[PDB]
Amino acid sequence: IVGGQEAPRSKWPWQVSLRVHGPYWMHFCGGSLIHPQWVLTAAHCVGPDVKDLAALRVQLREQHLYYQDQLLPVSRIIVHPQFYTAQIGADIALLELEEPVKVSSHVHTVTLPPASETFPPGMPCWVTGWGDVDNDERLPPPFPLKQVKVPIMENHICDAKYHLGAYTGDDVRIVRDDMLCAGNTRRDSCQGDSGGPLVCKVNGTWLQAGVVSWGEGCAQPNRPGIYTRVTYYLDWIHHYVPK
Amino acid sequence: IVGGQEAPRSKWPWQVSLRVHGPYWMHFCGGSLIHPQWVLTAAHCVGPDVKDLAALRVQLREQHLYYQDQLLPVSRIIVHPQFYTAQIGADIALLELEEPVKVSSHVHTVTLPPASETFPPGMPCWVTGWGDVDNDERLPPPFPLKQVKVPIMENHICDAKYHLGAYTGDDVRIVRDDMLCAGNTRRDSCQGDSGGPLVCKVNGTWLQAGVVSWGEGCAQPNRPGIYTRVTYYLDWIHHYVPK
Amino acid sequence: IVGGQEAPRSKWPWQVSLRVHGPYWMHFCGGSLIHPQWVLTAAHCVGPDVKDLAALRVQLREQHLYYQDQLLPVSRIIVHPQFYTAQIGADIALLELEEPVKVSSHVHTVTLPPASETFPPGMPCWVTGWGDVDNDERLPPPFPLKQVKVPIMENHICDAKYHLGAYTGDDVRIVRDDMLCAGNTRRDSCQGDSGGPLVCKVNGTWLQAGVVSWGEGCAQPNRPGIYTRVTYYLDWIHHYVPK
Amino acid sequence: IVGGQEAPRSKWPWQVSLRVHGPYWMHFCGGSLIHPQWVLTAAHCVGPDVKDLAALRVQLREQHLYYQDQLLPVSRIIVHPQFYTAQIGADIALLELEEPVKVSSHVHTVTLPPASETFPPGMPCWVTGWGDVDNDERLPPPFPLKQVKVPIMENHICDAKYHLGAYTGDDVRIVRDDMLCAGNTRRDSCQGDSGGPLVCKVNGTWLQAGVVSWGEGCAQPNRPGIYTRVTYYLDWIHHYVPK
Ligand SMILES: NCc1cccc(C2CCN(C(=O)c3cccc(NC(=O)[C@@]4(C5(O)CCC5)OC5(CCC5)[C@](O)(C(=O)Nc5cccc(C(=O)N6CCC(c7cccc(CN)c7)CC6)c5)O4)c3)CC2)c1
Ligand SMILES: NCc1cccc(C2CCN(C(=O)c3cccc(NC(=O)[C@@]4(C5(O)CCC5)OC5(CCC5)[C@](O)(C(=O)Nc5cccc(C(=O)N6CCC(c7cccc(CN)c7)CC6)c5)O4)c3)CC2)c1
């Protein structure tokens, strides 16, 4: 998270950290608890090549990575079959947990938006995670969960911005219809935030609008952060995740 | 180049080295001289973001990088407008030199294929460059130009290999019709070879079939190297480069 | 620490962590609390060049680095005047804190040896710290304090091992009389343990025999760890540190 | 070499490069040809631990490393038995070549000073090599031999300078009597120059005054480069090297 600050302990009860087996169970991506037994993340965190389920675990909301881990095994990785790279799209994946989580005030699910939900441009939304604090700058120990408020932008404007200073033809699309953009040169998601949630409080209720997916670096001029647009994939989500 | 040998001095008179300004004019991609004032290379070497032309030079064929440099400045970078990433495609670009070079047996242009040539399996094809000699393994000093003979694999066969060990659905095409595949687990291009030529000998004349573009790693199982298919982009090249 | 285990919370109440200012207050050496206003450490951690005091803090015993920091500023760095490099010797220094700390069962001083104690082989001695767990292998998050029991080797025996596999003449002393040797190819201190304590239990009271100083690598054949011999420098310590 | 420039091809005919076996025969230290069959270098290049002679080779004067190597095997490494570290001293070593070199105008020996030679303070002397061009800044390809003129300083002044900004007692010697200092914050030797020569033209004749040994970094304030003083070790040199 670039430009953010450390979250309050009572916020973001759905944030999860994805861990890979090595010298220690290292954080490599975020995710969100969308059902007691399912985590929503980015395909590129876990694909497109098949990975060993035994080398993946999930950690539910922690204020500081690694301090009090209680790592959870995964029973299935479901990567959207249309995924090959983030810039092509379909950058979305589910992780089925071995057990359903017992939810509490502190750890519980996020609400998915209705299909008809229109997150208007400029709506203040929040992105969270334990990623880099700027380009090639790791989050320091003790690894606090960070948050930053990022305004939604229209795809047409996000696409336009990505063409400024690029050779790509102005009619050749960069920001696809299954993506969603937010952020600016002061506030953005970054590497290691991928897979985590972009949430908007709509009339009092938090909804997950996006999954951190890509961008050209972090908080660079005319390069806002790009997310997988949750409404676009609700039908695929609900093919696996009970409603 | 993986599994090469050092090229003989008399071979590959069209090979060029693209240099970026820093503590020294460092090689980052290859190219090919296709006219006395024009180099063909990969878009991803110079795009999709617009670069300062002053920080780019071209070196004509050299047997060892850096030892006898005579760097040439570039007047225009022209990147295919459909280009955004190598995985999507249109990974092709042109550099116009500030001056026409003088040709000789030593240093001369490569012939572009006619539109009809498909370069089927069994064609004798070579890829050349100053790239890594294996995954994350630099070409050592004195940086000789290397070559390797690479077997062509039909696109559909290549596409199918790319799906092995992947989550991506089998009907979601990875290897696109503007690409071409060549190489195996012994013989491949690698990072720093990008933008260089894949040339095949057809009725006694070397024709540039491909531009080194991407792959999953270098000489990895089921992951042949991928090249931009030059025939696809002849009309575009001809918008800029004279007969 | 090589071949350790994580220390129990109730052990080693004198262990401290020395921090340097940067993107975060990063651990670079250990120390020991020998009086409420004084930390003992290795000269090479803070010398021989004079450092900005403002860029140095001390952390009192912590079970995991960084998670619950309460950093303390230092008023004086006092480095043994004979010190230039750890191989020459006098690898010993004192930090005076700006305030006296409050002691407890949790956090308290270590007892210095009487001048007469030699710490011969077979004494039960432990070394503790937050250093590497093997050569070029960091302690992973969550950075627990580690301990390992290390066998003492008499100086002359140690000196003789240091000559094995070396060109240095056998009568040119390597392991000096102000050093002490402990450890083997399973059990050793390592980088980032420097300045921390080697403590041995003598008639029911833990005495600090040594300050982690140097070695050829960590747990390498014929290369036990080398510590500054605290008895050697008692008079110097007592110039500064009260009874 | 810091602050220098590329040498003329006709200068420094005695410079040699020491090579270690790996992915390529990499330069790691310099040396000087002091007899047709002997190279003078620094002990720390090849010691104090014993190394495999099969993994060492010598390269005679090259204008650019690696371009035209003709590597020579070594028949014996003689490390001064008083050597353990550069800061202690005796940082001098000989390498006996498998064959005597046929000397020429281009490649030939340097003259050793008489024992009585006094290189006065301020005498302009030259240091050469293929080392770093500043702290942690490698010499770029194509690796030209560099030179820099460095004035000799008296040991007493060099020692004094190393005490400025240090905790080491002003009467505790840092720059020993078997060392010699030269250089300043604009001109110095650096890492990878170790083992090479410091030469002074005395009344028309080049003599080797020093062997590059150590310093605190390169071209840092009050930290001139430190060399092994050749006159000090003439008797040891001439114990092995014919006169
Ligand atoms: N043997 C043939 C041959 C010949 C020559 C060269 C090679 C190479 C090709 C590359 N390669 C692969 O294995 C490889 C394979 C398949 C796909 C890819 N490409 C990628 O997936 C990737 C990545 O995006 C994944 C991590 C980088 O790598 C590519 C291919 C060459 C570079 C790329 O197309 C690429 O780098 N994409 C890209 C495109 C646009 C922006 C960014 C970028 O700036 N990022 C940093 C910021 C980050 C981010 C994360 C979270 C949030 C934000 C928002 N602030 C941003 C997103 C990525 C990255 O895609 C690489 C190694 C060998 C092989
Ligand atoms: N298991 C016990 C244990 C516990 C804690 C820690 C460890 C470590 C200890 C260090 N270690 C060794 O293997 C080791 C072993 C023996 C000796 C040494 N020391 C050295 O020889 C060295 C070097 O000087 C050799 C390269 C660095 O390393 C030391 C020991 C700790 C650091 C040192 O004392 C040291 O660094 N010396 C030093 C002293 C003064 C200046 C410079 C320096 O700034 N240099 C950079 C510039 C360079 C230079 C080259 C050419 C020309 C110039 C002139 N401009 C300068 C010279 C070195 C370096 O000596 C290191 C790894 C494990 C082990």
CB contacts, 8 Å: C141 with chain A: 24, 65-66, 141, 143
Taking the Cβ of residue A64 and every Cβ of chain C, the question of whether any pair is shorter than 8 Å is answered with: yes
A126 CB-side CA count, 13 A: 21
Q: How far is CA D138 from CA B1, B24, B138, D23, D130, in A?
A: 25, 11, 16, 18, 9
Residue D126 bridge partners (DSSP): D149, D199
Measured at the CA of A180, the angle between CA A175 and CA A182, to 5 degrees, comes to 105
Q: What token pair was written down for C186?
A: 């399973």
Q: How far is CA D71 from CA C228, D26, D50, in A?
A: 44, 11, 21
- PDB experimental method: X-ray
- The Cα–Cα gap between D135 and D133 comes to 7
C-alpha R_g of chain D: 17
- The Cα–Cα gap between D177 and D156 comes to 10
- The Cα–Cα gap between C121 and C119 comes to 7
- What are the sequence ranges of the domains in chain A? 1-12+110-231, 13-109+232-243
* Strand, coil or helix: D94: strand
Nearest CA in chain C to A63: C67
* Strand, coil or helix: C209: strand
* Strand, coil or helix: C6: strand
| Pocket flag, ligand 2, residue C182 (CB < 6 Å) | no
Q: What token pair was written down for B45?
A: 């070497």
| Cβ neighbours, 10 Å, residue D221 | 11
Give me the phi and psi of A196, to 5 degrees please: -80, 180
8 Å CB contact of C67 and A65: no
Q: How far is CA D166 from CA C18, C41, C46, C57, D173, in A?
A: 20, 17, 10, 20, 12
**The listed CATH number (3.40.720.10, 2.40.10.10, 3.40.50.300, 2.40.100.10) that belongs to domain C13-109+232-243:** 2.40.10.10
C233 CB-side CA count, 13 A: 30
**B221 CA from centroid of ligand 2 (Å):** 43
Distance from CA of A16 to the nearest CA of C (A): 18
- The Cα–Cα gap between D197 and D148 comes to 11
Nearest ligand to the C-alpha atom of residue B131: 1
Burial D76-109 (b: 16+ CB within 10 A, else e): ebbbbbbbbbbbbbbbbbbbebeeebeeeeebeb
SS (H, E, C) B162-195: HHCCECCCCCCCCCCCCEEEECCCCCECCCCCCC
- The Cα–Cα gap between A145 and A62 comes to 7
Task: List, in sequence order, the alpha helices (H) in chain D.
Answer: 43-46, 155-163, 230-240
8 Å CB contact of D172 and C84: yes
| Pocket flag, ligand 1, residue B216 (CB < 6 Å) | yes
- The Cα–Cα gap between B216 and A219 comes to 28
- The Cα–Cα gap between C167 and D43 comes to 9
| Pocket flag, ligand 2, residue D225 (CB < 6 Å) | yes
Q: Which helix (H) or strand (E) holds C162?
A: helix C155-163
Nearest to B84 among A77, A82, A168 (CB): A168
- The Cα–Cα gap between B31 and B91 comes to 13
Distance from CA of D79 to the nearest CA of B (A): 29
The residue whose two tokens read 């002397």 is D125
The residue whose two tokens read 């950290």 is A17
- Which DSSP state fits D160? H
Report whether D36 contacts D103 (CB < 8 A).
yes
- The Cα–Cα gap between D233 and D47 comes to 17
Report whether B142 contacts B64 (CB < 8 A).
yes
- The Cα–Cα gap between A80 and A64 comes to 30
Nearest ligand to the C-alpha atom of residue B193: 1
Amino acid at C15: Q
Amino acid at B153: M
- The Cα–Cα gap between C203 and B141 comes to 63
8 Å CB contact of C81 and D172: yes
- Which DSSP state fits C83? -
CB contacts, 8 Å: D85 with chain C: 85, 87-88
13-32 in D: which are within 8 Å (CB) of B?
23-24
CB contacts, 8 Å: C77 with chain D: 167
Nearest ligand to the C-alpha atom of residue B218: 1
Q: How far is CA A204 from CA A142, A196, D191, in A?
A: 32, 21, 63
- The Cα–Cα gap between C52 and C54 comes to 5
Sign of CA dihedral D211, D215, D217, D222: negative
Q: What token pair was written down for C154?
A: 């008499």
- The Cα–Cα gap between C192 and C20 comes to 12
Report whether B33 contacts B66 (CB < 8 A).
no
Residue (of D28, D22, D58, D52) closest to D40 by Cα position: D58
Q: How far is CA C229 from CA A211, B226, C224, in A?
A: 58, 63, 14
- Please count the residues of chain D: 243
Give me the phi and psi of D50, to 5 degrees please: -70, 140
The residue whose two tokens read 């510590």 is C227
The residue whose two tokens read 């303390």 is C72
- The Cα–Cα gap between C29 and C31 comes to 7
SS (H, E, C) chain A: CECCEECCCCCCCCEEEEEECCCCCEEEEEEEEEECCEEEECHHHHCCECCCHHHEEEECCCCECCCCCCCEEEEEEEECCCCCCCCCCCCCEEEEECCCCCCCCCCCCCECCCCCCCCCCCCEEEEEECCCCECCECCCCCCECEEEEEEEECHHHHHHHHHCCECCCCCCCCCCCCEEEECCCCCECCCCCCCCEEEEEECCEEEEEEEEEECCCCCECCECEEEEEHHHHHHHHHHHCCC
- The Cα–Cα gap between C82 and A172 comes to 70
Give me the phi and psi of C86, to 5 degrees please: -60, -30
- The Cα–Cα gap between C47 and A82 comes to 59
DSSP codes joined into one string, chain B? -BS-EEPPTTS-TTEEEEEE-SSS-EEEEEEEEEETTEEEE-GGGT-SB---GGGEEEE---SBTTTT---EEEEEEEE-TT-S-TTTS---EEEEESSPPPP-SSS-PPBPPPTT----TT--EEEEES--SBTTBPPPTT-B-EEEE--EE-HHHHHHHHHTTB-S-TTS-SS-TTEEEE--SSSB--TT-TT-EEEEEETTEEEEEEEEEE-SSSSBTTB-EEEEEGGGGHHHHHHHS--
- The Cα–Cα gap between C237 and A220 comes to 54
Distance from CA of D168 to the nearest CA of C (A): 5
Residue (of A27, A86, A61, A34) closest to A216 by Cα position: A86
Q: How far is CA A84 from CA A240, B48, B81, in A?
A: 20, 20, 22
Report whether D28 contacts D132 (CB < 8 A).
no
D91 part of the active site:
yes
| Pocket flag, ligand 1, residue B196 (CB < 6 Å) | no
CB contacts, 8 Å: D134 with chain B: none
Q: What token pair was written down for B200?
A: 């095949």
Residue (of C76, C49, C90, C56) closest to C213 by Cα position: C90
Q: Do D1-12+110-231 and D13-109+232-243 show the same overall fold?
A: yes
- Which sequence positions of B are flagged as catalytic? 44, 91, 194
Residues near D37 by Cβ (< 8 Å), separated by ≥ 6? D96, D97, D99, D100, D101
Report whether C15 contacts C185 (CB < 8 A).
no
Please give the CATH topology (third level) of the domain spanning A1-12+110-231: Thrombin, subunit H (2.40.10)
Distance from CA of B46 to the nearest CA of D (A): 23
- The Cα–Cα gap between D72 and D9 comes to 21
Residue (of A14, A45, A18, A9) closest to A32 by Cα position: A14
Residue (of B150, B148, B124, B132) closest to B203 by Cα position: B124
Q: What token pair was written down for D111?
A: 């003259």
A44 part of the active site:
yes
* Beta strands B15-20; B26-35: pairing state: antiparallel
